[PDB]
Amino acid sequence: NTQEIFDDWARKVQQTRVRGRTGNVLKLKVNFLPEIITLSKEVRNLKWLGFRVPLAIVNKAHQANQLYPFAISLIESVRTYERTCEKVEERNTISLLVAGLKKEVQALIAEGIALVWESYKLDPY
């Protein structure tokens, strides 16, 4: 009866962005935290045994319920942008043919980065 882990759930909840890296690769970052999977696990736990998890935790899950697929798509955009920026870093003559396209795409990328806790223009960005 691992009820202490169920207490740890409450304690864990009781506990776009940008940050540095190591190879000077300022990757695109999401304002959220990797907790959507934990919220889904909480839902599984609730249907699993009927825990009396705090209503504040359930409401935080509902808060993330309206913005989590946007964050998953953001994470996919981040990882695929990494996947192809490494490919551009591979050679050098790529710039001579992709330059204007790079500038126009990166300007919209920065405009998408501009969202900080704003569900109004969060989706078009």
Binding site: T16, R17, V18, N24, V25, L26, K27, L28, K29, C85, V88, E89, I94, S95, A99, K102, K103, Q106, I109, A110, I113, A114, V116
Partner: peptide, 15 residues
């Protein structure tokens, strides 16, 4: 023209 340093400029103090 730049490969990735343009994002290094639009992420240092962008938020």
């Amino acid at each position: 023209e730049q490969v990735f340093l343009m994002k290094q400029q639009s992420l240092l103090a962008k938020q």
